[PDB]
């Protein structure tokens, strides 16, 4: 080991140690433990607009009760929405099943907190991050990378590498006990059949009973919308308009939003009433092993429909093709924690400039249950869709004549003959089966 080794396996006694303080059991016990053992902890709670968080202000207050040197709320909502919109603009979603898309809400979230919490730590003179992200997940890598990109002098302390931490804490029962012995009644929540990670872009549910592919969405109580699959849940058809100005979502139902955070919060409400955007995916972790999740993203799903519809009516085939190619590649880079790397920047800026800036328009749709919806109208001054330009009603307005089309067809013949000749060559070399045959099963070569 040396001075520039990033990972610290032992608690840095007497030093300032930053903690991404969500206020759950793990971070609460860790913070208390770090103080007890001699470190000086600084708590940073990310305000991510979590749909299941009732009161962010209460969290720093508990950090101080547990002995934090300082505790603050870092507002990450604006950035989260801006990165979410950038991902949307670039179609940066690589996880999908028969078209149903996962909007990479977890990786976007990590890109935001990994950079913003480390920067907040740096401003307070905190160059050590006591990051509990586990050895078997994706976040250990994402946070490692985002952290070091933000603060080159960052050291990362991994408590689970410290035998004293493993012995005194460990499982949830031991951590819950450690809290109680220090005089803090940690209000243990009612246990669920899965784990949840959330932010205002979306929520992901996985692990525990969701590890079995025989279980699924039926066991999930959604936190950003209703259980649309249950008959007792009454959902009436609802018309919605979504308006974009140069790629930025600016209005919902004719109401203009100067604040994009407020706009996404309203998109979330609209999609949420219908259960729009939920999916079930098997994803490939960074370590090359699969995991399974149930996902929610009602607001982004709503915006995705409108943005895509406009893209298909505004951009040419090659542009749409590059957009989709770039997006799948960018999605994977995002998932790996490389959202700010040069290769990702290239893909991202290309979409923000040449694809998104032309997207000025409005899409009208009807939402019913889950992903059942209908398109009602699509409007844009930038549309290239124009059946009137294809009108052959008058000879004076027709773009081309029947004779012109025949001329175009004649240009295909040379390559057609080349292809037919390839087919015959492929039969002779045994790659393709001959055209003609027998009326009964036949003997092969």
């Amino acid at each position: 080991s040396n001075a520039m080794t990033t990972i610290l396996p032992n608690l840095p006694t007497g030093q300032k140690v930053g903690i991404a303080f969500s206020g759950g059991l793990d971070t609460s016990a860790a913070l208390l433990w770090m103080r007890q053992k001699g470190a000086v902890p600084y708590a940073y709670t990310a305000n991510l607009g979590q749909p299941d968080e009732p009161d962010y202000d209460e969290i720093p207050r508990r950090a101080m009760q547990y002995g934090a040197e300082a505790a603050r709320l870092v507002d990450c909502r604006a950035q989260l929405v801006a990165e979410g919109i950038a991902a949307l603009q670039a179609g940066a979603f690589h996880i999908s099943t028969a078209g149903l898309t996962y909007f990479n809400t977890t990786p976007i979230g990590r890109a935001v907190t990994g950079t913003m919490l480390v920067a907040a730590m740096k401003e307070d003179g905190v160059n050590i991050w006591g990051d509990g992200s586990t050895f078997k997940g994706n976040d250990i890598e994402r946070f490692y990378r985002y952290g070091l990109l933000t603060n080159p002098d960052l050291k990362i302390y991994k408590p689970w590498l410290d035998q004293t931490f493993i012995d005194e804490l460990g499982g949830r029962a031991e951590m819950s006990e450690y809290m109680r012995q220090a005089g803090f009644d940690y209000k243990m929540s009612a246990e669920k059949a899965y784990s949840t990670d959330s932010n205002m872009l979306g929520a992901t549910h996985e692990a525990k009973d969701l590890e079995l592919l025989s279980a699924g969405i039926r066991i999930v109580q959604p936190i950003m919308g209703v259980a649309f699959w249950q008959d007792s849940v009454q959902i009436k058809a609802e018309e919605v308009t979504v308006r974009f100005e140069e790629g930025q979502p600016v209005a919902l139902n004719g109401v203009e939003y100067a604040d994009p955070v407020e706009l996404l919060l309203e998109a979330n409400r609209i999609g949420g009433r219908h259960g729009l955007g939920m999916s079930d995916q098997i994803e490939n972790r960074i370590i090359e092993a699969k995991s399974r999740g149930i996902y929610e993203a009602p607001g982004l799903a709503l915006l995705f429909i409108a943005y895509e519809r406009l893209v298909t009516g505004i951009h040419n085939e090659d542009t749409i093709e590059q957009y989709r190619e770039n997006g799948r590649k960018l999605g994977r880079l995002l998932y790996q924690g490389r959202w700010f790397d040069p290769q990702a920047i290239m893909l991202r800026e290309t979409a923000q400039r040449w694809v998104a800036r032309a997207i000025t328009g409005e899409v009208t749709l009807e939402l019913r249950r889950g992903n059942d919806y209908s398109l009602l109208n699509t409007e844009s001054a930038n549309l290239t869709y124009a059946p009137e330009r294809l009108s052959m009603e008058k000879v004076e307005n027709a773009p081309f004549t029947p004779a012109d089309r025949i001329g175009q067809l004649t240009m295909r013949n040379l390559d057609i003959v080349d292809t037919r000749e390839k087919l015959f060559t492929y039969v002779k070399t045994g790659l393709l089966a001959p055209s003609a045959g027998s009326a009964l099963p036949q003997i092969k070569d």
Copy 2:
């Protein structure tokens, strides 16, 4: 002009002329007109398992009443399903809107009839095809290519290039009159606000009122399913199991199908009861102008869900990535009429072999209305999804340790520093905006 000139602008009097005889007004009047003018027409009606065709046998019988020299039914169902399954296996679908996919059912249909009807014509000594496909659509090019690939000596007569055809026929009122004057009361079907093309893979609706983006699925009476968007339409939730064996769909609801045509007919019934698979798309025609359609494909949509789900649980990330890249490229080639060209064969065979052959398994789902469904179970002996291999419960079974993961992280540092340095270089050259700023809007460079 030249002996190898494909297009004939004049009726070839006294010669054998093939007609793709659907039996609608256009082909009925054309066939009668061609006979009256001296040509010898041969009618070929493609049995495509059309969902709106009540009796295929009656069509050749009418061709003979109109003076056809001969009239045959060419059974294209087996081939249509085989090509549909190949497309499915290769994810050869390039037209989509926010994930909702068009299954290229029209282009697959043309690849089958364009080759099979021309081959049937050749057997009867017919080397001229009186093809009415219009000068402004995609099919004129698709049929031109498929036809010439099948029969190098094929000539194509386009009635609309013949001034005598334009003068005597033309609009539907003139054709309907021509029928009546020849003693045939052509029972014209009730007029619709759109045109429909169909086969057992799917149905497409476009033109007329569907040209307006302010109109949509609401004006369409579906022919392969119910009007799922109307509240008065009662749809009961339904559980379905779909089983694949080495990429081929072999069973539905535990019932094994030796005949793939019968299997797709049942898949169509199941999906049809729910309205599964309908979408609204703006597509890019071969001529680089956009058109709009409302699409149906209930059976293929059902199979796509199952196939995709299995692919995500069986194949590694690079394999899935190549599969999807190849599919979007292949979809476009298919749409262009290049399904049998070498570049298409490459993409297609790759999927049929290395992607599809590993797809042995069964997916269980619940269908509700439209594209609202839930996954209930996923089973396969070929799954690489395996949370038990990730289990750290025993030291003797864990694939890696916490210390091993730290080792992996340390391997990232060199490139992380390179990326951070790129970011600083990009700020200096003015490509990226600086990190730090002011509390109020600031003057830029």
Copy 3:
């Protein structure tokens, strides 16, 4: 036909007609003919820095002798070099044979003259271009597109569609005669075994004897360099330094160039003395038929070596991969005449910004004959190549330890087992042949 039909098949008598006046036989005879027949011709001669053009000023003077209403020289050199540099920066070259690259000098040239000559015509109130580009080449399409993009009201008159032009002119002997009968002794050049098209980016040789693949570079007298393959040609080894600043070539042999045109002219001289950059290619024309050429581009070949070398020492693997992917796609768009279309802009700007702006450095090489050269040095403050950062000499400076690498390897096991299991599955389904076998040829399944 209608008012917005671009192509005019008849000479527009009494109207202003622009001619891209190169001053060769075709344009000289056409200009004279157009005046004689009543049109009012305006001549525009592109100054392209042609290596075989001794005096551009003399050309407009001849246009006026032939009866041009006006004649001017449009300087296209600055733009030609800027577009050439942009292509270079984006590696926009899709035609190559075993790595030997064609720098798309003809298509770049057409993008420049097609836009610039049409703009010059517009400023003089000339909205008709009498473009002689032939019906069987690529340029007819390129000029059509570039012209209409530049001037939406442009009409293009194609003399070869005019029966009066075909009758009075036609072959070279007839045109040469037409000149003589009008009192102009057109000084007919000594005939060559091939046709040449050139500009300061490069020169292309094709047609006539070069149509035979049994002929090649041996019959070509190069115009931008020496015949390096001939023993009588003495070529001494020469050291050269090429320096870039943020992607722009700025110095050669320590001499800084404020004018990029002068820099390329010197690069051409340096590469030309050695015959650097020549190649033999079979390309695919827009009409899907092949053509063959012998190419020269000594200056661009020199710059390409230096730029590429720097790219490989500065950018990460993913960045280089996107750069090369984008370049091959962009090259094809360029060749089609779509250099200014949105899909091309995307690819081009991406390279100019994220790839090229980091390319600040200097490459030293030794040129011998043809493409035989050696790299002597590569320097750049932006290099990520840094063997000293990989030095394990001191424990205090090593980036990772041996134990760290072992940790990284353990992360591969799960996918390795999945791959081995796929291999066994592929043998069972018959896709792959088993590993073990017999000592003699064996019977198959």
Copy 4:
């Protein structure tokens, strides 16, 4: 730590340990040391047709002198050539500088020895490989993967993790001393300013003085060819013919080769006399850090020219595009040690079937010095290059007319107008700079 832990940090005393015995100082001392310490070593020497190996038979004989339990020569030449030919067919080369290509000869070599030596070990009941491949290179990962794919029960002992090995051996002086103390005067070869790895596909030189980019090919004494850059080296121009049959190289200079190993040995001799194929590359290692090499591959370079030339004359543009796209992706997978993984198989088989099987023909060239050569002839019954099919000499043979081409142009107008309108939209949103300007530098927005 775990029964399936691959890496062994301690010498397995009393157990059978396989050693890839090249017979250099490192493997000689290691083998002797392992025996002395109680292990039972089995030596396997790969016959790779190394250009610098004078006598393979002498190596096993020395292994036995040093105390090997058994020592065998495993003939890897046939497989090496077959994998080399497969790579060639698929253009699986991703490392290049201005077109000059590195033929991935080291990674191909590792794929062959990593699998073949492990299989040979298994036959002898040896399930432990004492692999000295270092902690900072690529081969540690390649061998790890190839080994485990071949033998799932393989354990890999890394001597450098054993403190007893580090203490007693270590540097070359210590190993050379250990040999002498055991009674073996190891005749150390003359020291070089770089390290070399070789096989009959090619040779790579790197490390030591080649780490400096100010040094290069000038300090290398080539082992597969002459020092073509030195004037004193006399090289006579030489004509060569290379013939392929369905993608397999079968003849050189009219002499047919039934044995591909013999064919490559002759190709190596021909290219070697000229120094054909040498290059200087900066590559990206698996660990995301760069390294520099000087490479030789005269035989493969010769075959690459012929294969590529034939590909350009036989295959259509889309086919060539897919071929090159697939190749760059496959090259990277090959470099990573994933040559036998599913995603690599897909790319590889596609080329072997649809690209290579059509490559039947012969290319004639003249080789001079280094990469300076000329193409003299290209012949193939499969060529699609055919200027006679483009001949407009007779009206009865012309594929299209001038009027037909005009028809084709008219089909471009709609998209041209869409693109022009995009350009105006991009100026309005500030993405593109306006067309018109001032005669002097102007104030911007």
